[PDB]
Amino acid sequence: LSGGAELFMRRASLKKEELVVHPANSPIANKNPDNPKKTTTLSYDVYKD
Amino acid sequence: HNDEMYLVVQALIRACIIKEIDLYTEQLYNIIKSLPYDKRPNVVYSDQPLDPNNLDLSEPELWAEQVGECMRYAHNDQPCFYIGSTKRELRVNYIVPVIGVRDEIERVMTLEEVRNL
Amino acid sequence: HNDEMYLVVQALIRACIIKEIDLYTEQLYNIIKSLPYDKRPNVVYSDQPLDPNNLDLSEPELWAEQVGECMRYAHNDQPCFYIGSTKRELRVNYIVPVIGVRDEIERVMTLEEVRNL
RNA sequence: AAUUUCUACUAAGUGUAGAUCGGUC
RNA sequence: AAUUUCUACUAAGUGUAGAUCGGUC
Ligand SMILES: [Mg+2]
Ligand SMILES: [Mg+2]
């Protein structure tokens, strides 16, 4: 170890109005053309940042 | 209550128009999310009511870059259409797909999205 | 032009209403076709403009049989909804999801379709 | 498109693949 | 929900697993 451990608190930037999600149980497309699958589906929320 | 109800009728005409655009945005969102990001059309974007059966090819705001990332609006859950890559932040909510690349595009390309696949 | 345009505007209001019903039928069609036939809601069926925000449970036509076999009706591209099994042949295209068995049921249960699973 | 921050993903289901010492223009 | 006809399916992607002889209230 060494001295100078620094704990940084960080505030919020993205407010609750401009959140965009990948929803639950919806087959969305896939970006990579080298994907052997073509769609994917989860059972919960995948947000944006 | 004469002209006030008249502009209310105009607002209801714009309501049926924006719900036709939202319906075609939903079904068009389904046929676009059916595509694996390579057979996607080059799509005109707008944040204005864009009415694909009454499209005007006049202004130079017409653009033909390939669409993607059509995810929600999770306060109101929408199909959202980034006009470039992931890191361009050009989210919109009104789209009309057309034929091919830029410069005096062809006219409409209505309901031929199943012929893209 | 005094009285005829009045019912023309009423026909446009009914057009906006039936396009709301068609839009909620589209989103509801997707959220029901994303369910594996066991967690399906018990669905009121009709072939009439059914408008779940303006629902009136006064008639004895209320019924809550579990929905199944929801698929495509490509002659006008309409989403078709069977209501029994495959072999009951009672296709409809207007649906309202509620909970449970028959008789003076829960009322509407709109916009809670993600809570089915 | 979910991260200690950055980038390309969904990649076996609130993640996965890499990389990062430093407060200063 | 595709069949020589019927049924349970989607079952590896214009199909899979079975069964069916007679014309006749
Ligand atoms: Mg990223
Ligand atoms: Mg059958």
C82 C-beta less than 7 Å away from strand E: yes
In chain C, how many H helices and how many E strands? 1, 4
Domain boundaries, chain B: 5-117
C52 backbone dihedrals φ, ψ, rounded to 5° = -60, -20
In Å, how far from its chain's centre is CA C3? 33
- Non-local CB neighbours of B77 within 8 Å, separated by 6+ positions: A21, A23
Q: Give the span between the Cα atoms of C102 and C105, in whole angstroms.
A: 7
Element (H, E) at C108: none
Answer whether B20's CB lies under 8 Å from A14's CB.
no
Q: Write out the two tokens for A48.
A: 């944006």
Q: Give the span between the Cα atoms of C37 and C55, in whole angstroms.
A: 26
Q: Give the span between the Cα atoms of C78 and C72, in whole angstroms.
A: 6
Q: CA of A5 to nearest chain B CA: how many angstroms apart? A: 34
Q: Give the span between the Cα atoms of B80 and B71, in whole angstroms.
A: 5
Amino acid letter at C71?
Answer: M
List, as one string, the DSSP characters of C11-22: HHHHHHHHHHHH
* C1' (D17) to CA (B112) span, angstroms: 38
Q: Write out the two tokens for B75.
A: 């306060």
Kindly state whether A40 is in contact with chain C, defined as any CB-CB distance less than 8 angstroms.
no
Amino acid letter at C7?
Answer: L
Resolution stated for this PDB structure, in Å: 4.1
B84 C-beta less than 7 Å away from strand D: no
- What DSSP character marks residue A40? B
Q: CA of C33 to nearest chain A CA: how many angstroms apart? A: 10
Helix axes C4-33, B3-33, angle to 10 degrees: 30
Method of determination is cryo-EM
Q: Give the span between the Cα atoms of B69 and B103, in whole angstroms.
A: 25
List beta partners, residue B65.
B43
Taking one residue from B and the other from C, the number of pairs with CB-CB distance under 8 angstroms is 27
